[PDB]
Design a protein around this nucleic acid. Structure first.
Ligand SMILES: Cc1cn([C@H]2C[C@H](O)[C@@H](COP(=O)(O)NP(=O)(O)OP(=O)(O)O)O2)c(=O)[nH]c1=O
Ligand SMILES: [Mg+2]
Ligand SMILES: [Mg+2]
Length: 342
DNA sequence: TCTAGGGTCCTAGGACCC
DNA sequence: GGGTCCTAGGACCC
């Protein structure tokens, strides 16, 4: 009962789309992100820009100090979305067991595919080809017996490549796998783990499960499992959006409620529009707001509420402003909704 | 250099129920 | 005291 799992992952996604649509962007360093003056960060960068050290999540300020000729694009989301719709129609030609993780990424469980003589490797290659014809965008892929290994595999041979891991390669693959490459282990976790001489899955193999649950709860089980190649999570295909939010970071910290209110007036129409798309009657489970202060502490307050409603979001924001700002400057105001359950 | 905006999932206490 | 809902917040992903 080995499953055949594919992870497909578009190369340089936003930047690739911008380079296809404008060829002159191809060989010069580019990134999608907001300007330095807008306090922006980098969404992604093309390869000529990564060469300079530009990365996603990097303050644009730093990107420019690292790469002064950086061309900065604002991003065209409908174009990325269009591409994402296309690559999912392509997957559906191969299986209906498709679990998208974002615009540019999806798991596929092809275990029971009678397609490329049942070869998970050919299906992958054939998906990547056909995405490139049809879209002029390259993708990379990872083939493995479980979700997370397929994900790690998809990074191993990018851009425009793939990587297969068979059950037989699994133990050698894990011995040296750093924990930080496990999805769900980021900076903080990696540092706590490294603080106790745990760097690889091989280090974790040697640990006791009881102590691991004691010092991490459910996370430590997951760590213990994945360190062993164990990942019983099924490719889902039935997931639904749970929430929607709209937030803006000001060029300068605000200090007056009039300013906050004015921000909210512009945020609201945008949230209404985006919600109307998926819930015309605007019916919801919870609505609330978000402030982030100059000490980067962020606070949210949200409450049960039957329908998107501007005035209540403003009143809630005023309470929050008045009750938990303690004279700090404010860098960010946000609106938020929790969707109904079914 | 100076730290986005779109989300998901998990944890933890009190309310509330039984 | 165990479920589960409510609200707040953190880590992480893309
Ligand atoms: C990680 C990340 C990605 N994104 C956007 C831009 C990317 O083009 C897109 C896909 O994410 P990715 O697969 O993590 N990165 P990528 O596709 O640009 O690069 P790679 O080729 O997959 O390494 O999502 C951000 O807007 N902020 C982020 O911090
Ligand atoms: Mg990608
Ligand atoms: Mg991705």
């Amino acid at each position: 009962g080995s499953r055949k799992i594919i992870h497909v992952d578009m190369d340089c996604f936003f930047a690739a789309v911008e380079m296809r649509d404008n060829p002159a962007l191809r060989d010069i360093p580019i990134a999608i992100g907001g300007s330095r003056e807008r306090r922006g960060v980098i969404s992604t960068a093309n390869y000529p820009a990564r060469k300079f050290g530009v990365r996603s999540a990097m303050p644009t300020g730093m990107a420019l100090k690292l790469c002064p000729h950086l061309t900065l694009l604002p991003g065209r989301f409908d174009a990325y979305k269009e591409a994402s719709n296309h690559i999912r129609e392509i997957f559906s030609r191969y299986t209906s067991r498709i679990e998208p993780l974002s615009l540019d990424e999806a798991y596929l469980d092809v275990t029971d595919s009678v397609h490329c003589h049942g070869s998970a490797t050919l299906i992958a290659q054939e998906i990547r080809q056909t995405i490139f014809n049809e879209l002029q965008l390259t993708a990379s892929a990872g083939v493995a017996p479980v979700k997370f290994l397929a994900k790690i595999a998809s990074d191993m041979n990018k851009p425009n490549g793939q990587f297969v891991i068979t059950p037989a390669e699994v133990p050698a693959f894990l011995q040296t796998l750093p924990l930080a490459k496990i999805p769900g282990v980021g900076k903080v976790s990696a540092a706590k783990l490294e603080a106790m001489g745990l760097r690889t899955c091989g280090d974790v193999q040697k640990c006791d499960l009881v102590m691991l649950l004691k010092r991490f709860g459910k996370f430590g089980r997951i760590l213990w499992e994945r360190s062993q190649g164990i990942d019983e999570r099924d490719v889902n295909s039935e997931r639904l959006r749970k929430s929607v939010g709209v937030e803006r970071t000001m060029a300068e910290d605000i200090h007056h409620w009039s300013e906050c209110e004015a921000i909210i007036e512009r945020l609201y129409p945008e949230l209404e529009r985006r919600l109307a798309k998926v819930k015309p009657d605007l019916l919801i489970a919870r609505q609330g707001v978000k402030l982030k202060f100059d000490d980067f502490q962020q606070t949210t307050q949200e409450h049960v509420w039957p329908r998107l409603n501007k005035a209540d979001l403003i009143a809630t924001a005023r309470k929050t402003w008045d009750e938990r700002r303690g004279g700090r400057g404010v860098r960010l105001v946000g609106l938020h909704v929790t969707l109904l359950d079914p």
